[PDB]
From a paper:
In this work, ARGAHs from two model plant species, A. thaliana (AtARGAH1) and [name] (MtARGAH), are structurally characterized by X-ray crystallography and small-angle X-ray scattering (SAXS). Based on the crystal structures of AtARGAH1 and MtARGAH complexes with ornithine combined with the analysis of sequence conservation of the key residues of plant ARGAHs their dual [name]/agmatinase function in plants is discussed.
Residue numbers in the entry:
A (entry chain E): 20 to 338
B (entry chain F), F (entry chain D): 19 to 338
C (entry chain C), D (entry chain B): 21 to 338
E (entry chain A): 22 to 338
């Protein structure tokens, strides 16, 4: 295949994909602005990327399933603390980055990660939209947080729910591994505090990463003692805001079977809500990652789990 | 099509044959307890296999027989947590099932069907020492059951209600008998003084007005730790006719009870309900276990086992 | 107390039979007022699973089948064009309350008798004809006995099964679900017995097939037997044809929701090819051994059993 | 605001069509530079499920099908020897972003028109030919409409389905997945419509079959029809042949992952024998109604649907 | 070093002595009963690590044995043989693949252990080896042992969705996608009759042609049916070997396999061919049952057990 | 009518071959650890694939190979929660499976088979510094295992026992070796001083007497919250030969461990076992993980991972 046909087409296809996101973001931004009475609106951007996974790539299929579950007929549209999701200023959908089609053009991982970052900035460029990213595997948090921090001009504090620290300097030769985005984030200087919750699978090399970057890694084996800390968090003060990343496998596999990495002895769903509902600070973006529909039960319980996490994060981020 | 005159006569005769069946089963079990002595109250299972007042899935219509079988699953023994023997008929007994499907198939309307459920409950209460423990079925059945208990005893009860949902909608999709409204109906009839709800985590702002309008004590999951010592030391019924306990299986976390229509993540642990139930003080005069849905259960029927244990433990507290 | 026990048994059983009688009276009067009907397939549930040798979940089948007949994903027309919304094509009578009756301490002979009387109550109301929903396969004996007594003679039987169900003595249970057709042949209630789908048969039951002149069609010769099976003509010279369909005659890939999986079974289309072409006066039938507790989450075997009922009803109603 | 809302819909629809156009242009230029190709089956996903009558899960199918085409448990050669690693044999264009356009308030007529124009954008790039991935079966109408209009005449259609999909009015939805071939026959976009697998059909739709000269082959005559259906010759005298493959044409034991289980369907080899021997200039086709939300944990129906795509593409590419 | 290999050798010899004593037992039992010329003897090879997608067939042998002699399934084969008669079928045991692997033993030596285990069975007249896989790679060391022990070639009847004839599959000489390449290269087979084939690359079609393999594809099954249901194999060589890959069956009937290939054989297709096969059957195998991909009810274990029961009836005499 | 001289000869020779296999494997691993140095105890896995003493389902016979595979699942890493590296043979190693099926097929009775299991455990203990961590198999195997550990060490042990059931039935269905009686056999033999049970939620009144008779310390789920400070600070083994840890997988709630034979709702969370086991003080001399039933697990094999993690965390506490 010729080099010119490749270089040009890649840019044409990528330009078209970004234009679609830009038009959708303009549509929703204009809508919120014509409604008034809104300071921030959680805006869903799907990033259906699985190929940085180390075991199973099914989370690539997650974003459309999460969006549907948000409106399951078995549920109502009010959040636990009383916000109405039927209000467009509380939550709106922007769209999905077309990862598979862009990848199919022969685009490399660096450029792909750059398209993700540009898509996040398109959303942030429309006041009052704030990005709530649907994964996809956890690799997407690096290009998302990089974009948020670049757009805001400074660091954020990060609340990170995970069974895994995701701080590998080098996982299997993949800079963009879903096991490394937070090493990428701390290397770039995009985060101040990194508060990790649910950790129960961590190697000794990564324990040195935690020490090196001043990460606040809360392990399940101390959760009873750490609970008053985690349920009283005040992040962001002094920097540009707070970013909340929620890996669905932070929950016990009994609660969230639909994930690639089962790690028994995880969080209860009410643990995450307690922490998230009590969190103080200016949330400027977030993600819900690693829901894997291909490993879910036939009743789609993990789609509902992921949807409720999105609903409760949106209630905290919209203003 | 068919003569409405033919329908009305069929409806009366079929309803009368169904009530006569329940009466003879109740009279049977009544005479059996009274011949055994040493019994002041016997929890008596009445199935109400009704699902068509559900808003999402009707599979709980099939629950009551699956619950009764799980009470005697072969992987389990017959003793309750605090030592009561389920092989003792005075501890627990089965009356039977209201044949909802066949009555509905006569063209009976929803008001009449609710009246059949109420009359079935009164047939049970008529036989000393039986007390009704109702197996749903969706939660709409708590209205005609609680109405019956209250009418038969001649006064209000206090209600302990385990649920993810307050079930207090004034008007849910135009169905007065919606499973999302039975406690709005109960409060409108004044059948309950106190209504203590536990497990709540899905509530609309309109329904919050209902809670304050009727003085309901609605305990939400986000305050359960703060509320725990109150709830594990409950004392109900004093001054009125007794205590009624309604257990919605979806009050439990979906990881523990997947066999329900309405999955709501972040629910009660099975031990949460037992702590409250086993510690509850007051004269339990009836109760129900509702919304188990076999069609959404795991292949090994884990939620049937869950629902049976709830029935087992409520019976231990009601029988004496 | 022995007197309290007989009297309660009499009175519970009587009230149960009155319920069935009143339901059948209603549906008979309904069809007779509609007119233009010689026979209406009428569903009688027999939720009995305790004569099973492995798993008793088919006790729960009858209500699941009735629901799947009207599943929202299907339409109400049979493959050859009958409309199930026509009450003359199919109607529900009710379920015998087996659990409540057995809970009165009634023994198995009296239980079998209550099933027989319930069937006869359906047949008493022109033009209803009984289509029984099991329940395990033991119920076929009291049902066929009732049909044959009420009609005054023998019937021919078309019987779909993976197993002959012809054991003289299965683990000491006379009413075992693996013995009902031995009981039927012993009583002379049936003349011809044509079994289709057999792939699990002991050498001891092979001598029961010789003894009674059963026509046993085994899977291994299905291909050669296909012209005969797709042109069956039963009942001529006797009182009619009774069709018993054991759901586990179907391959487990099609019907996972059964107690006894036997690989290499019938395809669903094999049963329909035989049933839709069957000539003869069908006077009753049954669909048994659907076990909801062994079905898949989608309930495919409920739909399978419902479609067997729908297609049997299309042939029995006229 | 209406006039503003319309301008926003227009810009969003335009950006979506531009994305499909650049993807088709890209793949078109790739095939032409490779040479030695007359037709390349080109996958266009239409993730639409909201015209379904029972379950909308087939909205999620296209990306699962594409992944299964390259499952690590399979190899990349089709049964008759074509290599899927050759971009000339199969290639992906993209998915119409149905959800995001619907979310602008676009109504169903405009949505169908966007589908039609997307198909035309593929056909505009020689030598791409559209192989559409549903989505529910409603998409076949705007797809066949676009194929017929672009080619300038009628096509003959080979249609695998449990259901005729010929309802004049299914529940008030003109775009119902139970009516696309009514819409196709009304518009004159097809000459012959040859349906295979039919086993769920109402009497009003039997009248539709007669009214449009539809050749509806029901399962109850499959063995008799087999020499006809396995030597089909379509499209001569018209603009070509279009193949619509509804996955629920297969028995649910083979394809559980569909919204409408209908027991007694085709075996997979039945479809292959017909499709592999089909003669005629295939100008387009689709594979519809795979529902991953009702599939088994192993995703067998995704593999079933992928193999149908793979074999259809073997016949269409040349 | 040189010490390491002596330590592995003690583990291997202990494993082979276990097999030898079990075969010794069953061999003595048949000879004392009398009235028997051949007894199908089950040898498990719980090996899954030469699989290209999923290794779960490593757990198959004990699941299959349980389904042969289990509950709610009678004990007579289709054409009438008594499975409670030890002369019709008997269990020898399982090669302890996992423990030998855990000693650092390489794949060539592991395959040698498999061959020698087969030969210990053949040594105890009248037992004949019926091997339970495990993935299909085990057919190579098994057939090599059968042929070496009999001193000549065998004709092979092979049921499979896949020809398993890759000369080189992903650089693994012992790949489960290559055992019949290894068999043909080794000169252990004369005829190779393959049935059920519906997944074959053009490179492998060249292998088929080069070795004169008789590869019957599903797309021509109907017209091949007369030839296939009157097979006569083994005349002039040392006997017939029957290899049954469970994924030859349609995945609707046999979902418990690693490689789902839609459009497979019906259960009756295999049994018609197998039961009408003429020729002296000297060994066989049933491979690629994967319990970790079976239904919760284990229907494929039942499928695999029935295949084993019908092969045993044909091999025992 | 099968010659007994032939059977008995097969029994002795097959059992000898089987024990010689375990001996050589133990010698292989023991030599390896001695050549590596810096080790005082290495947890060594011994499988006992026995399910025929189960009262409901025998599927746990298939567990040991599944558990070992899940210890190295590609989705996990090889570091335990508190930092030990399973890739280090001194931390965990495999010995092998007792071939229960092949020995039974020789006509060996249940006493002789329990004896084979005991001698296999002693074969592991002979090789310094291996310590037995037994993979079941149903819970009947704990009796011959603890018998062997006690005899080899010459005295009693204290036991930490995780279970939904006390397993203390004197006579369960006429089977002396029932999986519901191994701790009655242990206590009759005097191989245990203290028996601390955790997770108990299914206990009959008869067995309540058994607990009294042997001084068992039976902590029921009913009191878990009060008992948590005691159970998460356990000091066992002082004054005797060591501590044996028996983990029955059905101690965990069925929502976590569906792949067991006996589902009993309201059980332990996985974090409950870890909190107790990671904080346990005492010289652990052996352990087992029993009753994982792969045939009742979900298709993702979650209970295999659950069991594997329990083995991984027990090995971390036993190896040193
Ligand atoms: N009984 C359950 C009612 C559920 C309903 N979605 C609600 O809004 O509560
Ligand atoms: N994001 C999940 C990474 C999982 C990997 N096995 C690890 O060792 O962390
Ligand atoms: N495309 C499927 C339509 C199904 C509908 N129940 C019918 O009667 O055709
Ligand atoms: N034994 C299975 C081999 C499967 C392989 N993907 C093939 O190309 O045949
Ligand atoms: Mn993670
Ligand atoms: Mn993560
Ligand atoms: Mn409720
Ligand atoms: Mn509720
Ligand atoms: Mn049968
Ligand atoms: Mn039968
Ligand atoms: Mn269709
Ligand atoms: Mn269809
Ligand atoms: Mn193979
Ligand atoms: Mn194969
Ligand atoms: Mn236990
Ligand atoms: Mn135990």
């Amino acid at each position: 295949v010729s080099p010119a046909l490749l270089e040009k087409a890649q840019n044409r296809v990528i330009d078209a994909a970004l234009t679609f996101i830009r038009e959708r973001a303009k549509f929703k931004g204009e809508l919120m602005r014509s409604l008034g009475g809104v300071a921030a609106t959680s805006s869903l951007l799907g990033v259906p990327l699985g190929h940085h996974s180390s075991f199973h790539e099914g989370s690539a299929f997650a974003p459309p399933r999460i969006r549907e579950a948000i409106w399951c007929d078995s549920t109502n549209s009010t959040t636990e603390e009383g916000k109405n999701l039927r209000d467009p200023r509380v939550i709106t959908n922007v769209g999905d980055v077309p990862i598979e089609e862009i990848r199919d053009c022969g685009v490399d991982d660096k450029r792909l990660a750059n398209v993700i970052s540009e898509s996040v900035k398109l959303v942030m460029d429309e006041d009052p939209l704030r990005p709530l990213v649907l994964g996809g595997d956890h690799s997407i948090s690096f290009p998302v947080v990089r974009a948020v921090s670049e757009k805001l001009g400074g660091a954020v504090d990060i609340l990170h729910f995970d069974a895994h620290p995701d701080l590998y300097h080098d996982f299997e030769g993949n800079y963009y591994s879903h096991a490394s985005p937070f090493a990428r984030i701390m290397e770039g200087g995009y985060a101040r505090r990194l508060v990790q919750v649910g950790i129960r699978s961590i190697t000794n090399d990564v324990r040195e990463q935690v020490k090196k970057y001043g990460v606040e890694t809360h392990e399940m084996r101390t959760l009873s003692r750490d609970r008053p800390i985690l349920e009283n968090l005040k992040l962001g003060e002094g920097v540009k805001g707070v970013y909340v990343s929620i890996d669905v496998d932070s929950l016990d596999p009994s609660i969230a079977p639909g994930v690639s990495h089962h790690e028994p002895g995880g969080l209860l769903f009410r643990d995450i809500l307690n922490i998230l509902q009590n969190l103080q600070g200016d949330i400027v973006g977030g993600d819900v990652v690693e829901y894997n529909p291909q490993r879910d039960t036939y009743d789609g319980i993990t789609a509902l789990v992921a949807a409720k996490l999105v609903r409760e994060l949106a209630a905290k981020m919209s203003k």
